[PDB]
């Protein structure tokens, strides 16, 4: 399949070169997989989700996305126009308040929620979780993300927007999950992107167009926006039967565009997510 005039990040993940604007992908498009977006919530009524998104858990007075962040990320995972996996199912977990912050204990309880709730859903092609959030180092936030991965869910988490080593952040520093940096349209590391040996992959993160609350759209930047590109890709690759939840981050890194990014500090991987689709 081919989507003309796609957002630059979608076109990049199916190209060996920057500067294109068409996204190519197998038409299975993630059918039969599920992605949890653990964030500020999802505006499920957005016409871009086509009835494939819904809220399943909130820790606040409303499960509504009064912020926009959670909606933006969920659109990069699986909205018809801005999504990687255009036929996957989206499950919203609201662990951040409408100001975009949340306690660590609420974030941990959301992660344990998904590790059990996938047993209440139909996902015969596999389960992905996208965690567009983070803060300071916490061994108990790291361990919650390890448990979720171990339960059979591919976990993708943001490196962080501090322009520092991601070792001092959680759950970016958990080694068994998939830590995602951010790149821009000229194949440069985003100026805000964290780095380090803990990073596993880079995704498109600067000026990413996607859904917004009120049925709108806008373009924002962050390792929070590279993370749903990889999360959607994993759901796409598991539908095609090319990998499982336990080895999706490893598979994505093996099949990635190698040595194409600039301003990657020594000791950090130089890998850009790539769907390897031959139309």
From Swiss-Prot:
Enzymatic reactions: Hydrolysis of keratin, and of other proteins with subtilisin-like specificity. Hydrolyzes peptide amides
Cofactor note: Binds 2 calcium ions per subunit.
Cofactor(s) it depends on: Ca(2+)
Task of the protein: Hydrolyzes keratin at aromatic and hydrophobic residues.
Protein name per Swiss-Prot or TrEMBL: Proteinase K
MF (Gene Ontology): metal ion binding; serine-type endopeptidase activity
Every Peptidase S8 domain range: 7-279
Positions annotated to bind Ca(2+) 1: 175, 177, 200
Single GO biological process annotation from the record: proteolysis
One CC-aspect GO term: extracellular region
Organism listed in the record: Parengyodontium album (Tritirachium album)
Top EC class for this record: hydrolase
Family classification: Belongs to the peptidase S8 family.
Binding site for Ca(2+) 2: 16, 260
Enzyme Commission number: 3.4.21.64
Active-site residue list: 39, 69, 224
Keywords: Calcium, Disulfide bond, Hydrolase, Metal-binding, Protease, Serine protease, Signal, Zymogen
Full-length numbering of the shown residues: 106 to 384 of 384
Disulfide bonds: 34-123, 178-249
Keyword presence, Lipoprotein: no
């Amino acid at each position: 399949a081919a989507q003309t005039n796609a957002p630059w990040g979608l076109a990049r993940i199916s190209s060996t070169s920057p500067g294109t604007s068409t996204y190519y992908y197998d038409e299975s498009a993630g059918q039969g997989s599920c992605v949890y977006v653990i964030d500020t919530g999802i505006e499920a009524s957005h016409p871009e989700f086509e009835g494939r998104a819904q809220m399943v858990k909130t820790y606040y007075y409303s499960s509504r996305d009064g912020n926009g962040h959670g909606t933006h990320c969920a659109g990069t995972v699986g909205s018809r126009t801005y999504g990687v996996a255009k036929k996957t199912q989206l499950f919203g977990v609201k662990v951040l308040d409408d100001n975009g912050s949340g306690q660590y204990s609420t974030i941990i309880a959301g992660m344990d929620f998904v590790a059990s709730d996938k047993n209440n859903r139909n996902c015969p092609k596999g389960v992905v979780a996208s965690l567009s959030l983070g803060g300071g180092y916490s061994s108990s936030v790291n361990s919650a993300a390890a448990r979720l991965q171990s339960s059979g869910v591919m976990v993708a988490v943001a490196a962080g927007n501090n322009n520092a080593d991601a070792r001092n952040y959680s759950p970016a520093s958990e080694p068994s999950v998939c830590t995602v940096g951010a790149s821009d349209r000229y194949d440069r590391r985003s100026s805000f992107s964290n780095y380090g040996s803990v990073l596993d992959i880079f995704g498109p993160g600067t000026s990413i167009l996607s859904t917004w609350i009120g049925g709108s759209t806008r373009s924002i930047s962050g390792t929070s926006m590279a993370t749903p590109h990889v999360a959607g890709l994993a759901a796409y690759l598991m539908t095609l039967g090319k990998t499982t939840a336990a080895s999706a981050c490893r598979y994505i890194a093996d099949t990635a565009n190698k040595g194409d990014l600039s301003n990657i500090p020594f000791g950090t991987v130089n890998l850009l997510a790539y769907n390897n689709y031959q139309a």
